[model samples]
Target: MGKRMVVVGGVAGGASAAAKAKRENPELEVVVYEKSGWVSYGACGLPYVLSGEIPRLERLVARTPEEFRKQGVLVHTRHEVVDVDYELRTLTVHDHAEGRTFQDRFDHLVLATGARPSLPPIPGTEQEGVYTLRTMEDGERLLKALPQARRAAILGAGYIGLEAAEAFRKRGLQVTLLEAKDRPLPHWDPEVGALLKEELERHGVEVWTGVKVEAFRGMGRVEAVETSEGVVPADLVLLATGIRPNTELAQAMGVALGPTGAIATDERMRTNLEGVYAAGDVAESFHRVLKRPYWLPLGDVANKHGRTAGSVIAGREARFLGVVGTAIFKAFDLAVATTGLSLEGALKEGFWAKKVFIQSRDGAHYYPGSGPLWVELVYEEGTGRLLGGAVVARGHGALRIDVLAALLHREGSVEDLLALDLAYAPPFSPVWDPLLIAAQQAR
Candidate 1:
């Protein structure tokens, strides 16, 4: 019999890890247990589904449990692992259907427990109408409730909050977005974040910054949200404050957590414990640009993290190359993309950082659909090493950020970006691309 490997979660990273391990070494007994019935679905598409851009629920789900069984892997759904005995390599699971708890043993254990939607520590959140869209069920309920939700308030102006505001507006609801921070997208520079707020507000999302949600009010369901500043009546309140890692299990079993409070793992995704691994949103990864461990719970990073773990577990030499902290989002008429360290972040990291901000047309001056592309590039003044950059525009504007992402990987200088033989057509870009112009000016 093959050595059995048990995985505690079976969604993105959990699903990817088990599938890769099973395929690499067919003799290895791989089994996955997911607390949610929905598995291998793109949680990132929930907003699109709500906005009706995606046709149906089944569209988000990539694979079914039976699909894995056919590939020689056993998958169990609605089975929650309530306890872990790391020394004995045993898990205590409570099966939802049978309503019974049982212990299972494994030679190797992988935790992909993932994250939960963060709700504020406030009143009436337990009520019916209050929601957070982390799971498939949450999407289903929110989608069903959207038709009648005339007024909606999103209680955080992060990516989730901004996306949700757009979705609610598309569904013909009046949307108000609230943020505790002084600006939306707290990680971004104020200039960019403020532009995003303006774009959202321009499209009918009432933006309120620097206000903390105090409590939700209603008898059976939420009717209004009370904040530090004032009250906002809302029939639907979506909490998108942020997510902390689901790491109580790791902590209980003595798996070391990094500074970000997420499970710490080496390049190959090995946890501090023996024969145990952690991946996905629950794990903090090494930042290639920062030269430090970072907590970024994006889906793309989760898959890469899982792949690295699976390859190593299957007896292959593999190491995660680390992350560059690249993030992009669609906000109405604007597409915002960013990579590496911001000027402020670079300075905080003790680099002699300097930045240049510029705006130019995305295409030739006469192009019909050309829009302004705003760019901010950061670099070390002495070393000339590209530290970070941001782009906000329409169409292919964010794609320029992709160029900088590759440059950041190599610590490419302003001269390197300027020398790129980027394609140019009147309808696409000017003779001097906006990025080239920025690079030339920054130098």
Candidate 2:
């Protein structure tokens, strides 16, 4: 063996790290220690599975343990890594099935322990019907209980909560979304979130803002959720409050934790500790625009983080370039997207930021299938450089943020955006595409 390597967690981050590392150094002994029975699966597809869009849960899994083993990587599932002694360079893994614990040594160690869905401290959260969807087991249980659920209550108004509400509505169940805040999407601009709230209401979703769930009441399973406003009848409850990074194992091994309560890593995904690396939701990544480390628990970002760590560990040159905080989510027929920073966020960050909002046709105005799109560009007041942007549309308009994302990546200016020759057609986009129009408005 070239060198013994141990990886904790085998989901997106760990799987990417393991695969890349092995491919870079075939003779290296790479072993992935995953606590879950399943690995290399898309947890993000859980909402679609609940909505019945995805036919089977197994289809979400990208690769199997046997398949990975054939690639010269040993993937051990159902094994919990309790502790790590960095000085001694050893791992204490507990075999859940055999009820045994053992020690393993490693030359290089990678930690990709993902995050877990948060369950609030509200009473009756322990009730049978109360659930938090994170793992495959959680989704399976929620799906199993769906037949008896006519009404659903989802706590929090984050992305997961919004998606869960949509899923419940797709199942023909009444959805009551109780958000502690006064808006639908807290990370977005207030005006944009107001639009979403209006749309969700129009689509028959009960949007209850400034409401707090005090407790869940029921006989055996949850029947109703008692809130600050009143009791909302619900046969099923999903705690979609948000997620917290699973950095206990990393912290226990004396790894530094960032301000966001996630394991802090550099561009190389290497922690302060030598020969030890961290990635995924468990790790904090450098924010490109914010000029600091931020915890962005997206699979795409995690894969990049993993590949960066893997390449460096494989004796190759690589480093994570940081994130622009881009994200997109679908709510009913509306698609919401944002990249870089919101106007509010930029202002809070002490930047002389300003924004321009415009309403335009997604396609040509004369086109029959055209729809309206709302685009907002946030930028530095003096520089006129595109710092961030957001778009909401019923059709494929939200994807326009991808073009802005490319601009933000290179610190593009309004002038640079106006000069680009994007595709143009009456059936597709207007002769003056939304991007160009928005750019001209910014200028």
Candidate 3:
């Protein structure tokens, strides 16, 4: 028989691993085990679904288990790998529906266990009406509560929390966003955070910073969140505090854990243990900018990591190029995105960094839909190499941020950003795009 590869967890990373493995080594036996019933679904679209933008839950599933089988890969849904015997190259999996456990042997194993939403130890967190949006089930629960939710409160001001705020607001909920930090998006510069605060207020979101939730107080269901400031009344509460790597299983199996609380893996996504590899949010991979190992729980990085693992297991040479922390999302009508190390992140890394912000138009001044685009560029003080960039824009201006993201990825300097050969049309961009204008200002 051909070599056998078993991948645990079947979402972005595991799904990519299985498909790539099948493509590269058609003779090999590839199987994937997903604890959940669904496989290869877009977790990012959950907020959009809650907002009624997606309208259908089925749209979220990218592929079903049967689809993988059609692609020449075996997929076991609702099978949880509870124990991993690294030395024996076997996993004890519990089939939830079958109510039985079985030992699955493999020549190579990949762990794409992903992360879990971090929940605070606040009292009454388990109460009804209190939810956290991580999986499809969480999204469904939040959607079901939306009909009776006239007022909603989110417990974090990060990307997920901000997105949920917009989603709830669209459903006519009075949204209040609470952040423990002094400002939203604290990773950005204070001035940029100030601008975000202004934008959130403009969108009718009650932005609260420097506040901590003490507990959830209500009779039976969640009615209010007791915060440092005061008890905020709410019909629903969403906890987007953060996420931690789901590394408990790997840790129990004697796999090494990185300082960041994620599985420590090399460029080939192989863990320290023999015949075992890890990818996705559960593992600490490399950071391109830092030139060191770092953990970033992002969908894009997870997909890339899976591909690398598959190639290596299939006897092909492949290496993950690491991540620069690129991400983008929307809040109401405003679009926000950032990539690479922010000024704060750079400072933490002991880099001599500086940042500049510019406000300009997305298109030619005469263009009817042209609107303001705010761009911030961070760079080494003397070298001018792009360290990071963030943009907050409305209307068509949001597209300029895509150019900024590209610039950051290429490590383009301020000069390169200004001289970018971007397409130009009066309806689309000015003689100089907002990115060019921002780079010029930075210079």
Best by TM-score: 2
List candidate 1 stretches off by more than 4 Å.
88-97, 440-443
- Candidate 2 per-residue lDDT, tens place, 1-443, comes to 48987889999999999999999999799999898888999998999999988888998999899999899999988888887777545554433334787888888889999998767788788878888989988879988988665989889898997988888888888998999988999877887888889888987899999997898997667899999899999988899888999988877778899899999898899999888999898999888788888988998999998999998989999978888888988888889888989999899999899888887877888999888887888888888888899888887555888988898888788788889999887876778877777775643
For every candidate in turn, the CA RMSD to the true structure comes to 1.9, 1.7, 2.0
Candidate 2: C-alpha RMSD after superposition? 1.7
Q: How many residue pairs in model 3 have overlapping backbones?
A: 0
Error of 1 at 271 (Å): 0.8
Candidate with the greatest lDDT versus the true structure: 2
- What lDDT tens digits, residue by residue, belong to model 1 across residues 1-443? 37888888898889888988888878899989898877899998899999888889889887888889999889888888777777645553333434777777777788899998766678788988888989999999998898886889898888887988988998898999898888888887777988997899899899898897888999978889998889999999899988988998777777889999899999889998888999899999888788889999999988987787777888878899788888888888888888999988889899998888788878789989877888888888877789899988887445788899899887799889878999888887778887887884743
Give the local distance difference test score of model 2: 0.86
Instruction: Assess every candidate by TM-score.
Output: 0.95, 0.96, 0.94
Error of 1 at 323 (Å): 0.4
The CA-based lDDT of model 1 is what?
0.85
Q: How close to the true structure is residue 237 of candidate 3, measured as C-alpha lDDT?
A: 90
lDDT of model 2 at residue 149? 55
lDDT of 3 by residue, 219-247 (tens): 76888899889989987899999999898
**Model 2 regions more than 4 Å off:** 88-97, 440-443
